[PDB]
Design goal:
The complex is a heterotetramer of chains A (517), B (485), C (360) and D (608). Chain A is α/β, with parallel strands linked by helices. Chain A is built from 13 helices and 14 strands. Chain B starts with a strand and ends in an 18-residue tail after the last helix. Classes of the chains: A alpha/beta (517), B alpha/beta (485), C mainly alpha (360), D mainly alpha (608). Chain D: Keywords: Isopeptide bond, Nucleus, Phosphoprotein, Ubl conjugation.
Chain lengths: 517, 485, 360, 608
């Protein structure tokens, strides 16, 4: 929905008790190429943390902005690994914080602490305001009430029984009620409107499921209990993949037929509206420069699910090389086209259906279409002379006035267009090759001294040409064409006179040097 | 795309007792009124596609989408008299033809011609609305059109009083299932032809007036007709619910290279046709226009032109079958509609730049802008979901250890990355294991016996052995196992 | 009584007469106190004759009436009335009659009740020869000298009905209509008729209030005026024929018929009264000896009046007499047999009603 | 010579003198009386003479003497009758003449001339006058006058018994009788006065200040005579009903010798309260007999002691008061006939003077019967009402229709309905468009109604009867003949309602596919009905016959099979609808009435 949706704020809490430290009974076979070592089983906490990290990676790639994530390990103490600022919502910072936390202690104090501390820290964290929420509240003065701060908290732990699950549910209900009550009086703390809770429970494979799965259950109009349960290892990874796919309204893609295996891409769901559980768009032959401008109705970022795999790496490297890739929906019809705009893989959504703007009227029959002397090349030069570029440094115009470069471009276009004849036959000064220095210099906002000497040389050359009675372009006597030429130059210069004093200078120099009868 | 759904049911054959003139059937009133609508179309909305499906017990498409309004005009006078009313089937068929022809994103106004006689039951409007609302069961109610439509109902059921006796709440609710995008039109008066003419004039003024605009590029200007009219847009429903519409003037704000622009995500592709304010070619044809010059220059040079349609809105004015014209787009209203162009409110002319960013030879280009934070597929992330990836990493680190000391730096970098990832994931026993494989490869050293190679692998193995303890000796993430000199 | 007479010889006539009247009042009261039945000696009569101009006479009458009003004892007033103003058979009776007439007229003028009652009592104890003269004087004074004076005598009806009855007795016994000059005046006849019609019992008050213990003396006034009124009614047509004004004759005839009807009603009331106090068939207020003179008078008039010319008047008179007799022995007022009635009516002219009454 | 000649001569001689000399004539008459005191002619003549002179005392004395001596002469009775007629300028003279007579003697003449009167009204008035002027005569002749009036008013047996006797009683006789408690009246004679008093009162109001409170005053006052009631004063007409109900709850128990006090009270008082409520209920309905309304029965959902009457307050504002007055009237009638001892007395008192079925009460007795739940006795009542007798006919047959319904007749019920509608055709304009569309008040699974008799009420009701009657006839077994055709046609009215029945019928049409309703397009002027029917013929419908053209069977049968007729058979079927839908707007009631009036042969199907 809006920017501050229910998925806008996501808080993760991870079990850190010594009970969450043993292996998950899923020993791996890293030894490929004598007698290899015993197979190594990754600990349940390690699997949960790494799968959570993958969830974070997918969410960051698909949504670089407007979506932050915290991380609260649940140990004897309550530690938050990153704040809500966009600058602190980084993958490497999370990795460094997790490394600093270290593996769970095996035999420190198993029964000293529980996960409830993480839950209360999370709900206490959830009531905070992000930077974007603060900006929204500031801009909506005296009306900063329609700002839904709904979030979502996900918990990973190994509960011994469903009774503990219910106890945690009641505890989180009570503590969020207390947090809402505390936020009612306070000003710099928004009251939670919708805090969805997920309580994934993990266990080593080969052990029974101590807790049965439960469906949605709203213990309050501010909570949603959706506690899932699954074995550790790859199952947890798939559960988290499904969670992220159904959290932010995602979709899957199974690009195939890549010359050298298939690859999987995750992106926003709206890219599949043309088709209307993974679509199987097929690679099509990439033409070098057939067409340049397509009709794209969407630009959705993507993130491969196996970024380090050989096929995904090859495809991403090829896209990042610069060339685009055209796909095809399964007689063929062109469809979604991949591209890499500076290092961000975009999955466009072309439009293959019949264009409602087909067979438009011929421009030769519309208004102004029966004239064949248009200054197309002159306007091409005009276009190329006002091309745009970004500016990372905001300068000050006069005094504390940080000018917007867009208004600068607008005023430059206005200055250029003060006297612009449209058709070739209309003008003669612009058609003359002598005035090109004037046509390129006088238009400037502030002519320099070199501009001054160039304009003086140009008017001197024009005077010499008049003295020699050279044949000017036809564009009706020689005196008549000379007179209309001086009229054109005088009209041009006086228009830009107010721009700078040098313009008035060249104006009165022309007035003195003109051969006015 | 306009689909004129005309009810041909027997209910429309009822004569109405008008005063003075002869008896006129409601079907014939409907006839004169659409004739008026199709005229205002062929005269002032010529580019607009339209279709006319007449619905009965079954719905049938007599005339598909076409710009030829003469065919539609004669189609009104060649109509049969099927005699059953069923709106749900008609709406389902309209969805079918719209999706089949255009798709799911193009707006498709629907003109509906009912008579306030929904039906007796079953296929009737009341029976469908009262039952299908509770459950779809793959029989989803077609009233919520899966595209930004606008349901206009020419309920020519005399005054609102006449249709309030039996059924008008059903119609007004039917409009609401379209999310309020529509309007009920009631002909007030004794069903006179002038009344229905005023009715259809109101419809024309509401929905089918051309969107005239002035295209001002600096100081040059021209009068254009942006076909089709632009739809209003809303940012969201929480912070800014007020819809926004483009300004009457389109100010060209610069130009950008068509290769740099890539293929931008637009809202809707709009034609721009000059409007004069064989006479057209003999008078308006010979006077120099600006749209012709702009389109020709854009085609020849091969660029586009950014446009400012208002505060925070921004579009594009590009050129182009063999036929070509000056079509205009609409970017997403916001600060950065194109994320690879920077904040679109931060684009300046090359004159204000220190040097010429585009280059003297027209080779350099600031576009596209690299995002401030790199993504994952471009960076070097470590993923250990499947055992295959971790096996690939360990195979890579083992193979490069054979090339030691040729690729010493790469092997050290990969080992440091693996150690950092293990420390982040707490995979200390994995670090001990990879130390064991490093020792094993040391035991299987080749007969070359490079002196510096053995020292590096032994030092690395010692580093992993000491770091696997979990103590502060190498717990630091900044530690990268510097190779021995 | 010589001392009283000697003392009065110096007092002026008016004063002395008053003083002797007062002395006689005192003496009469004393003798009434001593004895229930008083004796009127010749001494008071001699004194009153001896001592009891126009102005002097008027003053004497006024003071006498003032004393009569002042006196409260009725018996003494009646006794002195009899002592002074009763006839004595001497030459002073004419002066006594004149004085009594003027006194009664003067008292009637101002309606002095005791004088009227006393004069009513005296007429019952007086010979008719003086009652008729008193009636002459008073009727003349109140009917012929001063016109309009009949109204003055009319209000006496509400004062002394006994005096009215006595006046009717005297007038009826006087105006027997035996001569033209004896015809009663029209005004007097109308007044009498009106008085009798106002209340029939007016002519029976003397009969009722007088305790009948002995027969009335011969020559005295009758107990009731029924005889005189009957004579008037019967003789009326013959008298008016003999006298022969049409309107006055018609009025007189109507008044006489009304009087006859009133007399018949009075006779019926007298029958009731006689039955009540047990005189029915034993005492007759209309003495049978009085029929002979009336019958003879009717006969001589009938012979004289040429019945061929006065058949209607004679028939009316006979019918009136027959009706009066039929009521009289119907009411018991007349105590006579049918044979006696036949004997006295034999000489009368033939009449159907008279013959029916005679035959019964 | 006889004395009669002498008396005549004396009278004639006195008579001639009257215009000339009244005194002489009176003297002659007095002489004649003295000669012949036993002659009546003299006394009569002088009494007449005194009366002519307007002399009250003498004429009164002479009249008294002549009456005492000569009562047998008819002229004495004529003079007394004239004087008492004046008593009931010359009137003032005659009244003053009566005063001069002695009071006991005045009572003597009044009594004897009252006995001389033959007509009950005149005798009652004479005795009431005597009663009023002589309060001492209430004891002896107040009983006699009451008994005579009661018997001679009960013997009349008038269809509506009303004579100026009980009004006389309540105005004069009753108050002076009750206040003068010295009057001794037997308990039985007390009941006779109620027979008289009730008789006149019920009919006079059936045709003056306030008879109802007057007769209620009689009941309480006549009760106070010896032992009946001793209750309060201005009590309601409903409280005494329950009080009498509680009376018989004790009275219907043990009785030893007579129980006449309670048994007669529970009969007469209940009858009075039954009749008092009878007027109130009957007068409320069917007014203008001195718009009418008629009690009807349950039509309810045609598409779906403890009975309740449903009355819309719009047509009758005071329906609440009438409903309670009707309710306790039924109870009073029930108690009067539930008790066996009271029932025989109730029958006897009714047959004494109910006489005619009392058209107003004929409406009444027709009402509980239906409320009770029995109908055949009502049928006889309506038969009696019809024999006793525009709008008046309307009341009968629709009462027949509800009564002929009788839960399962369905043959005479419909027969009465379309017979009623022949007189129904007032509605050139019907009743507008929509006059306060039926309220959504849902009865708790319930009924009996009460409507006026002016088109807008009865017309929907009679059609509703036809809807249900044909509905049960055409929704079972098979042979979807004009049975189903009529009910679909009858379903045309109130279209938003019969959709379920219409949907049921078309489903049955699909199963059969042999809809033969030759006269179909003459009644179905409805767009939605025609629209649904054409839908069948297109895809897979039951190839509806719809022989909707006169003289089509003869054309098919009498013509040889030719191939140039199939096109016409298909085309005219569509052509008929196009003509039929062209009708569209019209008065549905007018069309529905037209369908019923022409299709009197519907009764052939209704026999099922």
């Amino acid at each position: 929905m809006k920017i501050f949706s229910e998925s806008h704020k996501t808080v993760f809490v991870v079990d850190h008790c010594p009970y969450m430290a043993e292996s998950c009974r899923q020993h791996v076979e890293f030894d490929m190429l004598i007698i290899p070592l015993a197979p190594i089983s990754k600990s349940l906490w390690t699997c949960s943390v790494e799968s959570s990290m993958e969830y974070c990676r997918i969410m960051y790639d698909i949504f670089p902005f407007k979506k932050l994530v915290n991380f609260i390990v649940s140990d004897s103490g309550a530690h938050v690994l990153n704040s809500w600022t966009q600058e602190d919502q980084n993958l490497q910072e999370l990795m460094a914080a997790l490394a600093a936390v270290g593996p769970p202690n095996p035999r420190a104090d198993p029964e000293c602490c529980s996960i409830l501390h993480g839950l209360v820290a999370a709900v206490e964290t959830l009531c905070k305001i992000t930077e974007y929420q603060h900006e929204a509240r500031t801009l909506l003065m005296e009306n900063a009430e329609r700002v839904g701060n709904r979030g979502r908290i996900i918990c990973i732990t190994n509960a011994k029984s469903d009774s503990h699950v219910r106890m945690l549910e009641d505890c989180v209900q009570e503590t969020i009620h207390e947090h809402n009550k505390l936020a009612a009086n306070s000003d710099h703390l928004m009251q939670i409107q919708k805090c969805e809770l997920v309580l994934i429970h993990t266990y080593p494979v080969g052990e029974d499921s101590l807790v049965s799965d439960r469906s949605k259950k709203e213990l309050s109009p501010v909570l949603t209990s959706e506690v899932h349960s699954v074995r550790a290892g790859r199952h947890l990874a798939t559960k988290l993949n499904i969670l992220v796919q159904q959290h932010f309204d995602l979709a899957s893609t199974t690009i195939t037929n890549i010359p050298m295996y298939d690859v999987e891409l995750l992106h926003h769901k709206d890219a599949h509206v043309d088709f209307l559980e993974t679509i199987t768009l097929k690679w099509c032959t990439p033409r070098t420069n057939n067409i340049e401008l397509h009709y794209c109705t969407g630009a959705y970022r993507i993130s491969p699910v196996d970024v380090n795999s050989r096929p995904s790496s090859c495809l991403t490297n090829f896209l990042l090389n610069g060339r685009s890739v055209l796909l095809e929906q399964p007689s063929k019809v062109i469809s979604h086209m991949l591209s890499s705009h500076g290092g961000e893989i975009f999955l466009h959504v072309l439009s293959s259906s019949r264009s409602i703007l087909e067979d438009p009227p011929s421009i030769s029959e519309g208004c102004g279409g029966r004239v064949t002397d248009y200054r197309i090349t002159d306007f091409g030069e005009f276009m190329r002379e006002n091309r745009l570029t970004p500016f990372l440094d905001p300068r000050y115009k006069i005094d504390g006035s940080l000018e917007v470069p867009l208004e600068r471009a607008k005023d430059q276009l206005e200055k250029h267009t003060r006297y612009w004849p449209m058709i070739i036959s209309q003008t003669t000064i612009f058609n003359m090759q002598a005035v090109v220095p004037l046509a390129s210099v006088i238009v400037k906002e502030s002519l320099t001294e070199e501009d001054v000497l160039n304009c003086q040389k140009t008017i001197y050359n024009l005077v010499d040409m008049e003295r020699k009675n050279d044949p000017l372009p036809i564009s009706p006597k020689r005196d008549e064409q000379y007179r209309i030429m001086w009229n054109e130059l005088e009209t041009l210069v006086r228009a830009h006179i107010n721009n700078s004093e040098k313009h008035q200078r060249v104006l009165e120099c022309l007035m003195a040097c003109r051969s006015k009868p | 795309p306009t689909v004129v759904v005309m009810d041909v049911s027997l209910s429309m054959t009822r004569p109405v007792s008008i005063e003075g003139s002869e008896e006129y059937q409601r079907k014939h009133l409907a006839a004169h009124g659409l004739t008026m609508l199709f005229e205002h179309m062929a005269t002032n909305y010529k580019l607009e596609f339209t279709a006319l499906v007449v619905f009965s017990s079954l719905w049938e498409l007599m005339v598909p989408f076409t710009r030829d309004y003469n065919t539609l005009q004669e189609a009104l006078s060649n109509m049969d008299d099927y005699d059953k009313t069923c709106l749900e089937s008609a709406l389902v068929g309209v969805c079918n033809i719209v999706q089949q022809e255009w798709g799911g994103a193009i707006p498709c106004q629907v003109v509906l011609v009912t008579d306030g006689c929904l039906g007796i039951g079953r296929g009737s409007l009341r029976h469908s609305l009262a039952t299908q609302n509770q459950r779809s069961e793959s029989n989803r109610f077609p009233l919520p059109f899966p595209f930004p439509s606008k349901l206009y109902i020419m309920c020519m059921a005399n005054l609102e009083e006449l249709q309030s006796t039996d059924s008008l709440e059903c119609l007004e609710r039917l409009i609401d299932l379209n999310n309020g995008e529509g309007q009920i039109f009631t002909i007030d008066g004794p069903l006179c032809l002038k009344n229905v003419q005023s009715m259809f004039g109101k419809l024309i003024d509401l929905a089918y007036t051309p969107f005239h605009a002035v295209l001002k590029c600096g100081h040059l200007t021209a009068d254009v007709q942006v076909f089709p009219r632009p739809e209003p847009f809303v940012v969201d429903e929480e912070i800014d619910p007020i819809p926004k519409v483009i300004n009457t003037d389109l100010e060209i704000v610069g130009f950008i290279d068509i290769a740099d622009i890539s293929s931008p995500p637009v809202l809707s592709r709009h034609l721009v046709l000059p409007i004069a304010l064989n006479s057209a070619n003999q008078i308006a044809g010979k006077i120099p226009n600006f749209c012709v010059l702009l389109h020709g220059s854009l085609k020849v040079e091969g660029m586009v032109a950014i446009v400012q349609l208002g505060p925070e809105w921004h579009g594009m004015l590009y050129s182009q079958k063999k036929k070509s014209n000056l079509m205009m787009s609409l970017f997403e209203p916001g600060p950065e509609p194109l994320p690879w162009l920077g904040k679109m409110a931060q684009l300046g002319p090359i004159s204000d730049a220190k040097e010429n960013p585009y280059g003297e030879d027209d080779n350099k280009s600031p576009f596209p802008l690299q995002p401030k934070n790199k993504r994952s597929y471009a960076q070097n992330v470590t993923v250990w979901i499947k055992p295959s990836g971790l096996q690939t990493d360990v195979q890579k680190i083992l193979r490069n250890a054979r090339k030691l000391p040729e690729k010493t730096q790469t092997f050290y970098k990969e080992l440091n990355r693996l150690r950092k990832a293990a420390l982040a994931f707490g995979f200390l026993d994995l670090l001990k294991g990879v130390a064991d494989m490093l020792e094993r490869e040391c035991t299987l050293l080749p007969e070359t016996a490079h002196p510096d190679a053995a020292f590096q692998l032994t030092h690395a193995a010692q580093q992993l052995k000491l770091a696997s303890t979990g103590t502060s000796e190498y717990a630091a993430y900044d530690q990268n196992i510097t190779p021995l000199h | 009584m010589s001392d009283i007479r000697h003392s009065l010889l110096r007092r002026d006539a008016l004063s002395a007469a008053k003083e002797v009247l007062y002395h006689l009042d005192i003496y009469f009261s004393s003798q009434l106190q001593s004895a229930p039945l008083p004796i009127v000696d010749k001494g008071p009569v001699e004194l009153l004759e001896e001592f009891v101009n126009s102005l002097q006479e008027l003053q004497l009458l006024e003071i006498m009436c003032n004393y009569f009003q002042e006196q409260t004892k009725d018996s003494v007033r009646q006794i002195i009335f009899s002592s002074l103003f009763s006839p004595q058979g001497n030459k002073a009776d004419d002066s006594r009659m004149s004085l009594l007439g003027k006194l009664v007229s003067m008292a009637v003028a101002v309606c002095r009740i005791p004088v009227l009652e006393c004069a009513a009592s005296w007429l019952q104890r007086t010979p008719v020869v003086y009652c008729v003269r008193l009636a002459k004087a008073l009727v003349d004074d109140y009917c012929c000298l001063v016109p309009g004076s009949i109204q003055t005598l009319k209000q006496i009806f509400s004062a002394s009905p006994r005096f009215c009855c006595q006046f009717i007795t005297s007038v009826t016994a006087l105006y027997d209509l035996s001569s033209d000059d004896l015809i009663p005046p029209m005004d007097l006849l109308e007044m009498i008729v009106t008085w009798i019609f106002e209340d029939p019992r007016l002519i029976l008050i003397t009969f009722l209030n007088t305790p009948i213990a002995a027969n009335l003396p011969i020559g005295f006034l009758e107990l009731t005026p029924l005889v005189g009124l009957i004579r008037w009614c019967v003789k009326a047509p013959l008298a008016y024929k003999r006298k022969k004004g049409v309107g006055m004759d018609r009025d007189s005839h109507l008044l006489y018929s009304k009087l006859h009807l009133s007399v018949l009603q009075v006779l019926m009331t007298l029958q009731l009264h006689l039955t009540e106090k047990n005189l029915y068939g034993r005492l007759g207020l209309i003495l049978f000896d009085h029929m002979v003179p009336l019958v003879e008078e009717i006969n001589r008039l009938a012979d004289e009046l040429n019945p061929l010319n006065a058949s209607q008047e004679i028939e009316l008179s006979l019918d009136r007499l027959a009706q009066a007799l039929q009521v009289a022995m119907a009411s018991g007022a007349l105590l006579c047999t049918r044979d006696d009635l036949r004997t006295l009516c034999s000489r009368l002219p033939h009449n159907n009603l008279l013959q029916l009454v005679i035959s019964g | 010579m006889s004395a009669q000649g002498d008396c005549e001569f004396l009278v004639q001689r006195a008579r001639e003198l009257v215009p000339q000399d009244l005194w002489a004539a009176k003297a002659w008459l007095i002489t004649a009386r003295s000669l012949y005191p036993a002659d009546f002619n003299i006394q009569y003549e002088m009494y007449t003479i005194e009366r002519n002179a307007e002399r009250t005392a003498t004429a009164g004395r002479l009249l008294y003497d002549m009456f005492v001596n000569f009562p047998d002469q008819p002229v004495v009775w004529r003079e007394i009758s004239i004087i008492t007629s004046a008593l009931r300028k010359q009137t003032q003279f005659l009244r003053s003449l009566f005063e001069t007579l002695p009071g006991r003697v005045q009572c003597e003449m009044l009594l004897k001339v009252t006995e001389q009167c033959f007509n009950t009204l005149e005798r009652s008035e004479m005795l009431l006058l005597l009663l009023r002027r002589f309060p001492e005569t209430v004891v002896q002749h107040g009983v006699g006058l009451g008994e005579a009036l009661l018997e001679a008013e009960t013997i009349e047996e008038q269809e509506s018994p009303v004579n100026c006797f009980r009004k006389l009683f309540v105005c004069d006789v009753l108050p002076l009788i009750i206040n003068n408690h010295d009057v001794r009246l037997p308990a039985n004679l007390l009941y006779k006065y109620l027979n008289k008093a009730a008789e006149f009162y019920i009919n006079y109001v059936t045709r003056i200040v306030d008879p109802w409170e007057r007769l209620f005053k009689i009941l309480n006052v006549v009760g106070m005579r010896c032992e009946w009631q001793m209750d309060k004063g201005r009590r309601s007409y409903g409280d005494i009903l329950h009080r009498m109900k509680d009376l018989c709850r004790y009275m219907n128990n043990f009785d030893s010798e007579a129980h006449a006090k309670y048994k007669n009270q529970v009969v007469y008082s209940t009858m009075l309260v039954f009749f008092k409520n009878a007027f109130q209920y009957v007068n409320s309905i069917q007014p203008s007999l001195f718009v009418p309304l008629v009690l009807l029965e349950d039509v309810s959902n045609v598409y779906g002691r403890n009975r309740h009457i449903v009355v819309n307050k719009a047509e009758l504002a005071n329906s609440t008061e009438v409903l309670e007055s009707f309710k306790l009237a039924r109870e009073s009638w029930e108690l009067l006939y539930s008790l066996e001892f009271l029932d025989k007395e109730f029958t006897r008192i009714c047959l004494a003077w109910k006489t005619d079925t009392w058209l107003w009460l004929r409406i009444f007795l027709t009402d509980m019967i239906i409320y009770q739940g029995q109908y055949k006795k009502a049928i006889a009542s309506l038969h009696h009402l019809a024999a006793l007798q525009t709008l008046e006919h309307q009341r009968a047959l629709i009462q027949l229709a509800t009564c002929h319904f009788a839960l399962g007749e369905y043959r005479m019920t419909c027969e009465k309905v379309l017979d009623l509608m022949c007189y129904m055709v007032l509605p050139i304009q019907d009743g507008g468009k929509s006059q306060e569309e039926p309220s959504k008040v849902k009865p708790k699974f319930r009924d009996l109604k009460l409507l006026p008799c002016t088109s807008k009420a009865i017309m929907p009701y009679c059609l509703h009867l036809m809807l249900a009657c044909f509905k049960l006839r055409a929704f079972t077994d098979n042979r979807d003949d004009m049975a189903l055709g009529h009910v679909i046609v009858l379903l045309q009215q109130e279209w938003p309602r019969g959709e379920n029945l219409f949907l049921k019928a078309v489903n049955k049409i699909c199963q059969q596919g042999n809809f033969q309703y030759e006269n179909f397009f003459n009644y179905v002027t409805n767009i939605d009905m025609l629209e649904e029917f054409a839908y069948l013929r297109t895809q897979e419908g039951g190839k509806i016959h719809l022989e909707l053209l006169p003289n089509q069977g003869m054309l098919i049968k009498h013509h040889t099979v030719t191939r140039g007729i199939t096109k016409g058979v298909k085309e005219d079927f569509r052509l008929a609808m196009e003509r039929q839908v062209s009708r569209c707007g019209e008065n549905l009631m007018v069309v529905l009435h037209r369908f019923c009036i022409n299709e009197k042969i519907l009764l052939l199907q209704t026999l099922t």
